[PDB]
Structure formats: C-alpha cells, structure tokens
Amino acid sequence: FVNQHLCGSHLVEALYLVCGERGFFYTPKT
Amino acid sequence: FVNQHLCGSHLVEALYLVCGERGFFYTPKT
Amino acid sequence: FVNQHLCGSHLVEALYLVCGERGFFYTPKT
Amino acid sequence: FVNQHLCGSHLVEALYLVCGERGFFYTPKT
Amino acid sequence: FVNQHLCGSHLVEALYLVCGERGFFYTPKT
Amino acid sequence: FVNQHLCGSHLVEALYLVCGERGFFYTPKT
Amino acid sequence: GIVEQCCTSICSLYQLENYCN
Amino acid sequence: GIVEQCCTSICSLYQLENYCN
Amino acid sequence: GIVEQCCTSICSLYQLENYCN
Amino acid sequence: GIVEQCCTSICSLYQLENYCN
Amino acid sequence: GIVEQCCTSICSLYQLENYCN
Amino acid sequence: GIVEQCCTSICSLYQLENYCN
Numbered sequence: 001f002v003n004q005h006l007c008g009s010h011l012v013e014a015l016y017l018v019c020g021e022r023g024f025f026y027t028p029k030t
Numbered sequence: 031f032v033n034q035h036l037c038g039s040h041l042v043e044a045l046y047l048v049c050g051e052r053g054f055f056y057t058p059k060t
Numbered sequence: 061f062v063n064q065h066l067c068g069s070h071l072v073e074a075l076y077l078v079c080g081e082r083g084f085f086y087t088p089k090t
Numbered sequence: 091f092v093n094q095h096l097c098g099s100h101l102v103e104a105l106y107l108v109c110g111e112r113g114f115f116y117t118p119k120t
Numbered sequence: 121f122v123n124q125h126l127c128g129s130h131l132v133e134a135l136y137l138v139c140g141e142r143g144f145f146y147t148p149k150t
Numbered sequence: 151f152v153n154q155h156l157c158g159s160h161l162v163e164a165l166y167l168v169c170g171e172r173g174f175f176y177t178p179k180t
Numbered sequence: 181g182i183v184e185q186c187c188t189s190i191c192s193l194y195q196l197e198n199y200c201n
Numbered sequence: 202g203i204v205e206q207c208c209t210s211i212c213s214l215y216q217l218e219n220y221c222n
Numbered sequence: 223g224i225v226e227q228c229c230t231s232i233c234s235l236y237q238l239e240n241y242c243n
Numbered sequence: 244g245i246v247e248q249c250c251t252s253i254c255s256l257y258q259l260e261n262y263c264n
Numbered sequence: 265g266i267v268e269q270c271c272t273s274i275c276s277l278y279q280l281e282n283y284c285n
Numbered sequence: 286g287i288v289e290q291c292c293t294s295i296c297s298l299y300q301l302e303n304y305c306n
C-alpha cells in the first residue's frame with residue numbers, strides 16, 4: 001500500500017544535495 | 031557561518047508535504 | 061518483519077508540521 | 091529568528107525513539 | 121528492490137544517538 | 151548552546167550518501 | 181487510529197488535521 | 202522567496218501553500 | 223518542559239525517559 | 244522520471260545530476 | 265552485524281549500545 | 286576533522302569524499 005509517498009521523500013533529500021547551490025524541480029505526473 | 035544550507039533543508043520537508051500529491055520547485059537565486 | 065517502527069516515524073514528521081504552532085499526541089495502542 | 095520550530099522538531103525524533111514501543115505527548119505551552 | 125539503502129539510513133540516526141557524546145563506526149561488509 | 155548535537159547529525163546524512171555502497175566512521179574527539 | 185488508518189495507506193492533510201490538538 | 206521570507210522567520214501553512222504548483 | 227529544558231541545552235536519555243508515557 | 248526510474252531502484256549520483264537545473 | 269541483525273528486525277537500545285565505541 | 290572543518294562551514298562533495306573508507 002504505502003511506498004510512493006515515502007519513496008518520493010527519500011529522493012528529495014538526495015536531490016537538492018546533488019545540485020548543491022543550485023535548485024531543482026519535483027513533479028510526480030505522467 | 032553555516033545556516034542557509036540547513037535553513038533551506040528544513041523548508042523542503044515542509045514544502046512537498048504541504049502540496050500533498052502535487053509537486054513544487056525550489057531554486058535559491060535572485 | 062520491520063515496518064511499523066518505520067511507518068510510525070514517517071507520520072510523526074507529517075504530524076507536528078500539520079498542526080503548526082500547535083502540538084499533538086502519539087500513542088500506538090488499542 | 092527561526093530556531094524554536096526546528097528545535098522542537100529535533101526532539102520529536104529523539105522522543106518516540108526513547109520510549110520505544112510506547113508513545114508520548116508533545117504540547118509546547120506554558 | 122530498494123530497501124538496504126533506506127534500512128542502513130534508519131539505523132544511523134538511532135546509532136549515534138544511543139552512544140551520546142561518544143561516536144561509532146559503520147561498515148556494511150562481510 | 152545546542153548546535154553541535156544537531157551539526158553532527160546533518161553531516162551523517164551527507165556522509166554515507168557520498169560514499170555510496172561503501173561505509174565510513176564517525177568519531178568526534180581530539 | 182493513525183497507526184493503521186494512515187500506516188496502511190497514505191491519507192490527506194485534512195484527515196491528519198483532525199488529529200491536531 | 203522561500204530562501205528568505207521563511208528562512209529568516211517561520212511562516213504559516215497558508216503562505217507555504219501559495220508556492221504549490 | 224521539553225521546549226526549553228532540552229531546547230536550550232542537549233539532555234540525557236535518562237531525562238528524556240521521564241517524559242515517556 | 245525520478246518517481247519510477249529511481250523510485251523502483253537506487254540510482255547513481257551521475258544520473259541524479261542530470262535532473263539538476 | 266547491524267546491516268542484518270537489526271536491518272531485518274527492530275532491536276533494543278541495549279543491543280545497539282553494544283556497538284558503541 | 287568533520288566535527289569542525291565542515292561543522293563550522295559547509296563543504297564540497299569532493300572534500301567529503303576524502304573521508305570515505
């Protein structure tokens with residue numbers, strides 16, 4: 001059941017940290 | 031000294047959680 | 061096996077953030 | 091300025107983890 | 121599929137907190 | 151007052167994530 | 181309550197607001 | 202915007218909702 | 223209580239255990 | 244994109260850097 | 265050790281204290 | 286080392302990679 005709400009929260013921390021001083025966008029949709 | 035790298039990480043957790051199933055963008059720049 | 065100890069920790073972050081300046085209680089029991 | 095909203099979020103993680111299977115209550119007020 | 125990268129990150133938080141002022145080591149290997 | 155207990159917790163998340171499949175050690179002492 | 185109605189399925193911010201003090 | 206208006210002072214859920222997509 | 227006695231200074235696991243249910 | 248290519252399998256820092264602004 | 269004995273089943277604070285320095 | 290050189294000032298991924306095993 002649950003897994004997408006927690007899976008999309010573990011990539012945000014490893015997302016802005018990768019770019020560094022830059023930012024990024026996050027939009028889950030097809 | 032440090033404070034912006036930790037201040038921008040405390041709002042990300044309270045950013046995607048606010049929208050909910052929707053996403054959002056984050057770009058620190060003027 | 062593990063899943064309740066981690067499932068109850070992902071809701072705490074999205075719990076106090078929802079109320080805002082207010083607080084809340086958490087007691088896992090029937 | 092900011093500090094109480096982040097200081098009360100660092101104790102929640104170290105609060106339910108201390109109790110363990112038990113729960114606790116959080117209400118910031120005098 | 122994913123689960124070890126997230127399982128080893130939930131114990132790090134409950135690792136340094138247990139020791140307290142002391143530190144510890146983390147090496148996932150046989 | 152508080153700042154080292156929270157400053158040493160923000161580097162652990164950005165520590166094991168940098169190594170990747172490898173691990174690391176953490177010991178705050180002179 | 182929240183250890184099952186939300187632990188077995190994501191909920192909405194409105195439902196989580198009903199648990200506020 | 203959020204790296205100053207809320208980074209130098211906590212904000213409300215309503216103001217943070219204005220940054221939603 | 224915990225929003226000042228521990229928010230202005232780290233505490234010990236023993237003191238945090240007194241706040242357990 | 245990231246809600247599937249990396250949500251169903253860990254990825255590398257190089258692939259995650261492609262999503263940078 | 266901790267990547268299996270506790271990664272496949274929650275443990276207690278006493279067992280986690282044995283991994284302390 | 287990391288409890289001061291990076292605890293008093295953000296660092297780069299290259300410097301943090303030097304602390305890898």
Ligand SMILES: [Zn+2]
Binds near residue numbers: 006066070126
């Ligand atoms: Zn998780």
Ligand SMILES: [Zn+2]
Binds near residue numbers: 036040100156
């Ligand atoms: Zn913090």
